[PDB]
Motif scaffolding. Sequence first.
Motif, PDB file in Angstrom:
ATOM      1  N   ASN A   1       5.931  -2.702  -3.322  1.00 37.72           N
ATOM      2  CA  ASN A   1       5.364  -1.402  -2.995  1.00 37.72           C
ATOM      3  C   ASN A   1       5.188  -0.555  -4.216  1.00 37.72           C
ATOM      4  O   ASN A   1       4.225   0.193  -4.326  1.00 37.72           O
ATOM      5  N   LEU A   2       6.102  -0.727  -5.165  1.00 42.58           N
ATOM      6  CA  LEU A   2       6.010  -0.043  -6.435  1.00 42.58           C
ATOM      7  C   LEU A   2       4.885  -0.722  -7.262  1.00 42.58           C
ATOM      8  O   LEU A   2       4.179  -0.060  -8.019  1.00 42.58           O
ATOM      9  N   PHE A   3       4.682  -2.030  -7.091  1.00 47.26           N
ATOM     10  CA  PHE A   3       3.623  -2.734  -7.821  1.00 47.26           C
ATOM     11  C   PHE A   3       2.156  -2.551  -7.339  1.00 47.26           C
ATOM     12  O   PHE A   3       1.186  -2.838  -8.063  1.00 47.26           O
ATOM     13  N   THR A   4       2.021  -1.945  -6.160  1.00 50.42           N
ATOM     14  CA  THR A   4       0.732  -1.583  -5.586  1.00 50.42           C
ATOM     15  C   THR A   4       0.321  -0.166  -5.990  1.00 50.42           C
ATOM     16  O   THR A   4      -0.647   0.368  -5.445  1.00 50.42           O
TER      17      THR A   4
ATOM     18  N   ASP B   1      -1.425   2.000 -10.705  1.00 55.60           N
ATOM     19  CA  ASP B   1      -2.603   2.902 -10.825  1.00 55.60           C
ATOM     20  C   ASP B   1      -2.227   4.314 -11.195  1.00 55.60           C
ATOM     21  O   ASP B   1      -2.934   4.994 -11.938  1.00 55.60           O
ATOM     22  N   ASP B   2      -1.199   4.794 -10.510  1.00 51.81           N
ATOM     23  CA  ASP B   2      -0.791   6.165 -10.559  1.00 51.81           C
ATOM     24  C   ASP B   2       0.674   6.400 -10.817  1.00 51.81           C
ATOM     25  O   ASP B   2       1.487   6.403  -9.906  1.00 51.81           O
ATOM     26  N   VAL B   3       1.003   6.686 -12.053  1.00 48.31           N
ATOM     27  CA  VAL B   3       2.371   6.924 -12.407  1.00 48.31           C
ATOM     28  C   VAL B   3       2.924   8.047 -11.568  1.00 48.31           C
ATOM     29  O   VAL B   3       4.128   8.258 -11.505  1.00 48.31           O
ATOM     30  N   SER B   4       2.039   8.812 -10.955  1.00 53.70           N
ATOM     31  CA  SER B   4       2.481   9.959 -10.176  1.00 53.70           C
ATOM     32  C   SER B   4       2.842   9.533  -8.760  1.00 53.70           C
ATOM     33  O   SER B   4       3.815  10.006  -8.173  1.00 53.70           O
ATOM     34  N   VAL B   5       2.054   8.626  -8.213  1.00 52.20           N
ATOM     35  CA  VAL B   5       2.292   8.140  -6.881  1.00 52.20           C
ATOM     36  C   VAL B   5       3.441   7.205  -6.996  1.00 52.20           C
ATOM     37  O   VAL B   5       4.302   7.156  -6.128  1.00 52.20           O
ATOM     38  N   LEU B   6       3.395   6.403  -8.054  1.00 52.48           N
ATOM     39  CA  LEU B   6       4.424   5.410  -8.292  1.00 52.48           C
ATOM     40  C   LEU B   6       5.741   6.155  -8.430  1.00 52.48           C
ATOM     41  O   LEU B   6       6.713   5.874  -7.716  1.00 52.48           O
TER      42      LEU B   6
ATOM     43  N   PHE C   1       2.385 -10.956 -10.537  1.00 50.14           N
ATOM     44  CA  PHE C   1       2.193  -9.531 -10.823  1.00 50.14           C
ATOM     45  C   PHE C   1       2.497  -9.027 -12.263  1.00 50.14           C
ATOM     46  O   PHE C   1       2.072  -7.935 -12.679  1.00 50.14           O
ATOM     47  N   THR C   2       3.123  -9.902 -13.047  1.00 53.55           N
ATOM     48  CA  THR C   2       3.400  -9.666 -14.458  1.00 53.55           C
ATOM     49  C   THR C   2       2.265 -10.183 -15.342  1.00 53.55           C
ATOM     50  O   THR C   2       2.417 -10.233 -16.564  1.00 53.55           O
ATOM     51  N   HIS C   3       1.140 -10.551 -14.718  1.00 55.46           N
ATOM     52  CA  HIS C   3      -0.045 -11.025 -15.419  1.00 55.46           C
ATOM     53  C   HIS C   3      -1.334 -10.463 -14.852  1.00 55.46           C
ATOM     54  O   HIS C   3      -2.339 -11.156 -14.834  1.00 55.46           O
TER      55      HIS C   3
ATOM     56  N   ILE D   1      -1.692 -14.870   0.051  1.00 50.78           N
ATOM     57  CA  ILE D   1      -1.892 -13.430   0.242  1.00 50.78           C
ATOM     58  C   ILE D   1      -1.663 -12.838  -1.119  1.00 50.78           C
ATOM     59  O   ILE D   1      -2.329 -11.922  -1.507  1.00 50.78           O
ATOM     60  N   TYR D   2      -0.681 -13.350  -1.829  1.00 51.89           N
ATOM     61  CA  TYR D   2      -0.362 -12.794  -3.102  1.00 51.89           C
ATOM     62  C   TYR D   2      -1.382 -13.176  -4.152  1.00 51.89           C
ATOM     63  O   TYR D   2      -1.627 -12.429  -5.098  1.00 51.89           O
TER      64      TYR D   2
END
Lengths: 161, 161, 171, 171
Positions: free
Chosen positions: A16-19, A22-27, B18-20, B132-133
Motif C-alpha cells: 500500500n505504501l508502494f502504490t 508518486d506522492d511523498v505526501s500521500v505516502l 517493486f525494487t525495479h 497480478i504483480y
Amino acid sequence: QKLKCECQALLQVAKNLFTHLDDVSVLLQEIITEARNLSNAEICSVFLLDQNELVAKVSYEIRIPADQGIAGHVATTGQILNIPDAYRTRNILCFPIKNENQEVIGVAELVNKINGPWFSKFDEDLATAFSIYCGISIAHSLLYKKVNEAQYRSHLANEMM
Amino acid sequence: QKLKCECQALLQVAKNLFTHLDDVSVLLQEIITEARNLSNAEICSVFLLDQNELVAKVSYEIRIPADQGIAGHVATTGQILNIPDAYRTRNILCFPIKNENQEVIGVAELVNKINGPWFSKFDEDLATAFSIYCGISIAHSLLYKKVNEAQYRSHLANEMM
Amino acid sequence: RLEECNILFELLTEIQDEAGSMEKIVHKTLQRLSQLLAADRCSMFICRSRNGIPEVATRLLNVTPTSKFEDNLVNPDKETVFPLDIGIAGWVAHTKKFFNIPDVKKNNHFSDYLDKKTGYTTVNMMAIPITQGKEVLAVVMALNKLNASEFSKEDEEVFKKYLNFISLVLR
Amino acid sequence: RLEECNILFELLTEIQDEAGSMEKIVHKTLQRLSQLLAADRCSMFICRSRNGIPEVATRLLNVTPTSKFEDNLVNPDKETVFPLDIGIAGWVAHTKKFFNIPDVKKNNHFSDYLDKKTGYTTVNMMAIPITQGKEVLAVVMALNKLNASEFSKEDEEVFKKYLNFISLVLR
C-alpha cells in the motif's frame, strides 16, 4: 497464528505504501494511517530529517531541531525508544527510519496505546519491521520527487526556446 | 503450511519486482526469474503487447502478431492456458497480464515442468496470483519510462536555449 | 467449546491462499485429530460414481502431525478404487454409518488390498461417512490407536466432534 | 520418526517473524502435545532465581489446540510465583525429575492455590523439568487426561519425545 498474521499484515501494508511512490505526501500519510493500525496508536506523527532538523509537516509544516526532544534523540541515536509513562498523553513509541546504509532519514512517533498500558515489546519488532518499508519507500519517493521537480524546471526553460 | 508458504513466497517476489520499477528491462528479467522458480519452469519468456503485436524481446528483440500462436491466443482471449503435452519441449503454462481494467498488457509462457508431468492446476492460481504483480509492476514501470524519456527530450532542447 | 475454537481458527491461519485449500483444510484438521486421538494416522477416501455406480478411492493417506500435504495427497493416476461391496471404507459409504472397529481381522468387510500394496498393517479403525443429503462425498478414518488396544467411546465423541467441521468444509 | 518431523516442521511454518517467537514455538508444540496425548491442557512455569533463591512462576496456562497465544501468555504483572517447597511444579524443579501423577489429591506436594484462584480442577498430571546443566529453566505439564483415568506409560514416551525439542528451543 499471530506471527503469520503480522506478515499478511505487513504484506498488505508493503503493497500500500508502494502504490504511492508518486506522492511523498500521500505516502507520508499512508505511513501514518498504517503505522497507527499496525501498532494501534491513538496518534502517529512522522518527521523527515531535513539536514540538521526534523520536519514533520504532518496540513501545515513543522520544523524543529533534529536533536531536540524525543524525535531528536531517536533521530540522533538511530535507535528505537519505548515509553510506559511519558511523565490525553501517556506512552510514546518512537522509531528511526534510516536508508540503505543506516542513515536515519526520518523518524516516527506513536502516542498512547488503545486497549493497553503501553507498547508491547512486540510492538517494536513489528514497528521495526514496518519501519524498513517506510525507509525503503520514503527514500525512493523523495528521490523521485527531486527528478520530477528538476526535469520540470528543465522544460519550463526549454519551452522558452 | 503450503498455502502460507506461497505467500511469503509472493510477499518476497512482490518486494523484488517493486525494487525495479526503475528498469523495465531489469524488471522484465525479474519477472522471468521469479516466474520460473515460483512455478519451477525450465524456461519463461515474457511478451509485452505493442499495439497489435507481442514483443518478447527477451538479449534481442522479438516481434510477432499479437493473435498468433499460444501467446497470441492467450493475449487475445485474456485467459490462462494449460498444456499437459504440447504436441526438449513438453508442456506449456501461458498466462495474460492485463492492467487496472483487465486489458491484457503482456503475456508470459513457462515451458516444461521440473520434477513433473505438467503444471499443477495449483500452478495456475499461483501463476495468476503472481500475474497480478507483474501487471501492476509492468504497468507503472512503462508509464515511468514514458516520462523519463519525454522529460529528457524536453531538456535536450532546453539546454539548447 | 474452547480448545476446538482455537484449534480450528489457528489451523485456518496456516492455509495458503492457493489450491485446493479445501482439501488442505481437511488435511490439517486430520493432522489435529491424530494428535487428539493419538491415532497413528488418518486418511480420507473420496466417494464418487460412474453412471449410478458408486465407488470409493484413495485421496489422503498417512496424515500425521508432521506429515506433508503433497506427500499425503494421492496422485489421481495412482489412486486405489474400491466398489462399495469391498472394504470397510466401501461398507461405510454403502451403509452411511459410523463404525469403531477394534480389530479389523475380526471384521469381514475388511479388505487387505491396500495393506498388501502399501506394506502398512491396519489393526483398528474408526470410520465415518461424510454425506450431502442422500449421497456420500467421502469416508474419513483414524487408524491404529497408539496408546491403547482400541479407540475408546470417548474417542468416538472427539472424532465425531471434528467431523461436523470437515463435513461443512467438504461442501 | 515420520509424523514428528512433519508436525514440528509444519508447526515452525506457522510462527510469525516477530517476538518472543521462541515461546510461540513452545506454545505451538504444547498445542500439538495436547492433541497427541488427549490432554485437556498443557502449561509451562518458568523457573528463575533471586539471590540464589529459586522460584517457579506461571507463564503459559491453558494451552489447547484451539487456544490463542496472547490468551495463554501470563501477564508478568499477574504471575503466580511459588517457592520450590510448594507445589508439584516446584517439586519437579527441585528434584529435576519427571513425574506421571495419576491423582493429585493423593500426592502431597500438590498445591491447590491456582485451582482456588483460577477455578480449574486439576486431577492428574505429567510434569517434567527443562534443564540447562545443573540449573532449571522451566517446568512443563500436561493436565487432565480426557479419554482415560490417567496418563499412560505410552503417553510418558510421547511427552518425553516432544520435550527434547522444547528443551532445545528453550536455549
